Structure formats: C-alpha cells, structure tokens
Design an enzyme around this catalytic site. Structure first.
Site, mmCIF file in Angstrom:
data_model
loop_
_atom_site.group_PDB
_atom_site.id
_atom_site.type_symbol
_atom_site.label_atom_id
_atom_site.label_comp_id
_atom_site.label_asym_id
_atom_site.label_seq_id
_atom_site.Cartn_x
_atom_site.Cartn_y
_atom_site.Cartn_z
ATOM 1 N N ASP A 196 1.464 5.034 1.609
ATOM 2 C CA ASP A 196 1.227 5.848 2.794
ATOM 3 C C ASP A 196 1.483 7.302 2.435
ATOM 4 O OD1 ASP A 196 2.806 3.170 3.633
ATOM 5 O OD2 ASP A 196 1.289 3.588 5.182
ATOM 6 N N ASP A 255 0.818 -1.208 0.000
ATOM 7 C CA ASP A 255 0.000 0.000 0.000
ATOM 8 C C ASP A 255 0.858 1.268 0.000
#
Ligand SMILES: *P(=O)(O)OC[C@@H]1CC[C@H](n2cnc3c(N)ncnc32)O1
Ligand SMILES: *P(=O)(O)OC[C@@H]1CC[C@H](n2cnc3c(N)ncnc32)O1
Lengths: 139, 141, 144, 137
Positions: A37, A35
C-alpha cells in the site's frame, strides 16, 4: 526490501515523479505483519502543469514504483492523499511510514488524524447503514 | 513468425468495445457521476480495450524480440522503436496500460480516460492494421 | 517454481478427486509453444457428470483456477481457463494445434478432439478475411 | 486488536453493491444474453462484492490466526470454524472466492451467480454484523 532500503531508493523518485511531495508506505507492510500500500501527496500546482502533457499520469504511478522498488507492479495499491476519505487519511497517518517528503509528514499527521471519539462516531454511522440494509432485505 | 489471425481477433474486439464505448461520448460529467452502472460499464470497457492491445503487443514482441521481458508500458514504447506504431502514438498511449483491496478508482479520472481512449485507440487500430498489410506484402516477396 | 510438463502430467492425476467430471486437461498458449506470463488451460468436462455436480455446487466453474493453482503450485491469479464445450472454433483450433495434453480419460480423447476441431488453412484464411472486413469497416466508420 | 471501522466500511460497500445487484433479480436469461452492458454491470458488481468479503475475511483472520496463510477459499471455511459464519454458509459461499489473455467468461454461469449472491451475501452481511455487535461487549 527493508524499510530503510525503500527509503534509500526513494531519493531517485523525483526524476520519474517530479510533482511528488510525499510518499508513505502504509498497510500490512508498515504495520509489522507482512500487497503493498502506497500513499502519495502531490504538489497541486506542479501536478496540474504535468497533467497536460500526460493526461493519465496517475495510472503510471504503480509502474514507476515497481520498476524502482523491484516489486510486482500488479500487487501495488496507490491512494492519492489530495482527494481521499478522512478515514483512509487517518490510517495512512497512524500506521504509515514515510518514504519521501519535502517536516511534511508530521504536518500531514496533525491535519488528518482522528480521535477515538471521531472514529466511534463514524463506526456508529456505518452500523446504522448496515442495519438499515439488513432491515430492508429482511435477513 | 507472426500469426495474423491472433492480432486480427483482438483488433476486431477493440473496435467492438470502442463502438460500445462511443455510446458515452457525449455524456456529461454530471450525468456520468450520477449513474454507478454507467461507471461500471465504462470502467469495464477500458479494461477490455487495454487488455486486447496488451495481448497484441505481447504477441508481436514474442516474435521480434523473442525471450525479452517487457512491461505493459515499455511494450508500447518498443512498438514505436520498431515503427509499428508512430513514436508519438506509442508515447501518448503507453500510460493506458495503467488502466488494466482499496477503492481508489476515481470516477473523475475514468471519465477523462473515456475521451482519451476514443481518441487514441482508433489510431492504434489503424496503425496495427497497416502493419498487418505490411506483413501480407513481405510474406509474398 | 515453474514446473516442467512432465511434472504437470504427474500432478494432474490428482485432479480426479477435486474435479471428478474432468475428462481432458490441455496446456496451450505460450507455455506449450516454449516462449514470464500467464498459464492457459483448456478443460473438457463430462457433460453428464458436470450437471449432477453443478446441482449441489452452483459455482463449481469458478473454483477450477484455484484447484489447479494449489495442485500445480502456480499462482492462481495467472491461470486462464477455456471451457472447450462452449468455445469458439478458432480457440479450439489453437488448443489442438499447439496444446500439450496433461490429463485424459479415456486415452484417445485428445486425438479425437484434434480431429474434430482442427481447421485447414483455407478455413483459417476465410476467418481472417471476415475479421479484416470488420476492421476496415470500423476504420471507415470512425474516419481514421 | 481488531478494527471494527475497517470491517464496517467493507460491509457497508457490500450492502451498496447488493442494492444495485438487486435490480437484476427478476431478469430473464434471454434478456441477459442480449445485453452486453448488463453482463458488464453484473460481472463488475460480483467482483466488488467478493473482493470486499475477502478483505473482511483477511482482516479478521489477521487477528485470530496471525501469521498463518489462508487462500481466499479457505478463509471463508475458517470463519465457520470460529463460528463467525455458520458452517453451512461458509461452505455454501466459499466458492464465491473464485469470482474475484483470453476472454473466456460464460454469461450463463455469471447469470447463475447473480441469484447465488443475492441469497448468500445478505446472510454474510447479517452474520458478520452480529460478530461486530459481539465485539462491542
Ligand atoms: P486499510 O488498512 O485496510 O484500512 C482501510 C481504512 C479504514 C476504512 C477506510 N476505507 C477502506 N476502504 C474505503 C473506501 N472504499 N472508501 C472510504 N474509506 C475506506 O480506510
Ligand atoms: P492465443 O494464442 O493468444 O489465441 C488463440 C486464438 C487466436 C484468436 C482466438 N481467440 C483468442 N481469443 C478469442 C476470443 N476472445 N474470441 C474469439 N477468438 C479468440 O484464439
């Protein structure tokens, strides 16, 4: 996209996010081990005026970055630096890479970084809560 | 063509979730912050409501503009361009799609989203319900 | 990579090892109709075998999406599972009407399933009336 | 190259979630089915717990086998190969990774998962905590 590429597209973020003061890519993508950030710092004055004609503007942030950065909006995490924990601020400053500012990231680094003595003090505090849990539960 | 039973099921759920969500309509921020369970309930309801509406929007747009890809946000806006929702409601409610690794969920922002949902989603039920009644008449003539 | 239904039918044969109690697997939803979203799968379990398996593994239902994602090579996060043994008549109806079968044992399990759960338009319109009555009652109670 | 403060934060949250989840330890299946809110609380707690555990596993395996890709399920199993978890607990708890357009959630299966989490995740807290104490030396 490359860190340089993300920075080039970021100049156009002022149009879609007017109150934005700084955007930092931290986490796994910044640390050099792929993912996504993202940490944002807002102009508190400008943000309060905008939050009146748009009460849930914080919930639209991940979509705005995904459309411009061409990344899956479902795998984007947003940390609001104006009201987050000291520990999260520390890791954003230590490993994060700045994507937009308006000498603002360095001021942020100097203001929130923690020393090893401060970190070891926090980690000792958390081990005490963990051990109390283990004791209270008899495991 | 559009299948009313699919939309009517999600609309009925939205109303059911909303009836639950209204039990917190008069709760104070202090009372809301002091109960993690109530924060879990309300955060969970807003997710169910938004997901149902997203499902309705995707089903409708599956038939009008078949094949075109829409994000959750622009899907709401596109329902305003087709007059299925009023453009005011579509713009006011499209950021709700943002409600669906890091614990960045602020209870102060969710508490605002409760009153937001209690004001905009009943209107969403009304306007979608009228579109269905619009569908019943065109299917007749 | 988006696999074709024929490709899914080959890969589903490998489910017997990881899901021994699996009796039927049906791909329904948009992926069956034809219209970049999520994958809908309906499963039918051997209730006898499932109870023996659930003894040694209490959360076996929660690993099903991961099992399909690894075998079909599709994102496990975009996999929805409907358990036909405890689902609404309306959902069972749509699985039978538009779904495409991916695995069955025996071979006459999907057709027997279709005849048992399909609804007539008269039954469907009766459901639509009950839901519209609840929707209009909601709107009256909320003053919108 | 491993960050104890990162693991300890997630572990401390797991303990908080579990302390809340323990309020459902003596609840009856009938009382559970008759309360939608309790099902929401319970479904949300189990998601928060497993997600923290997945984050801990991802951070730990990020340092030992850097670059190797592991699914959430295999991560638990791999912590057993490194003796960070007992292989028994890694096998028993790895199906938790499944807890992280159709509302096909069965309350009866979530009800079973409450008891599962209340027995397995304290052991996860204990075992990960011992790994952290090993790191101090
Ligand atoms: P990140 O690169 O994974 O590091 C997380 C960093 C260290 C702990 C702190 N943290 C993580 N999650 C937190 C919550 N939920 N609250 C406070 N601090 C947290 O950030
Ligand atoms: P799908 O084609 O999008 O849905 C199939 C059919 C339409 C309504 C019914 N349905 C869907 N989701 C339901 C829930 N959560 N409860 C009852 N009926 C439902 O399935």
């Amino acid at each position: 996209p490359t860190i340089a590429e993300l920075r080039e597209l970021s100049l156009r973020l002022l149009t879609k996010i007017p109150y934005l003061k700084m955007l930092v890519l931290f986490g796994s993508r910044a640390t050099g081990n792929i993912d996504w950030d993202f940490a944002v710092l807002y102009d508190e004055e400008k943000y309060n005026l905008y939050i009146q004609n748009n009460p849930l503007a914080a919930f639209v942030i991940p979509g705005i970055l995904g459309e411009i950065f061409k990344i899956n909006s479902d795998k984007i995490d947003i940390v609001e630096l104006n009201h987050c924990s000291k520990l999260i601020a520390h890791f954003v400053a230590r490993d994060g890479k700045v994507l937009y500012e308006e000498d603002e990231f360095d001021k942020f680094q100097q203001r929130v970084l923690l020393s090893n003595t401060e970190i070891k003090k926090i980690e000792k505090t958390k081990l005490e809560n963990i051990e109390n849990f283990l004791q209270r539960w008899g495991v | 063509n559009i299948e009313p039973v699919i939309i009517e099921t999600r609309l009925e759920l939205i109303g059911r979730y909303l009836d639950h969500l209204k039990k917190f309509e008069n709760i104070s921020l202090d009372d809301y912050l002091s109960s993690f369970e109530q924060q879990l309930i309300t955060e969970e309801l807003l997710q169910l409501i938004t997901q149902a509406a997203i499902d309705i929007n995707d089903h409708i747009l599956s038939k009008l503009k078949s094949g075109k890809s829409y994000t959750n946000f622009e899907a709401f806006i596109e329902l305003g361009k087709y007059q299925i929702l009023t453009p005011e409601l579509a713009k006011q409610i499209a950021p709700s799609s943002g409600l669906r690794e890091y614990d960045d969920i602020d209870p102060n922002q969710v508490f605002m989203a409760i009153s937001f949902a209690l004001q905009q989603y009943p209107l969403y039920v009304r306007q979608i319900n009228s579109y269905l009644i619009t569908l019943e008449e065109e299917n007749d003539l």
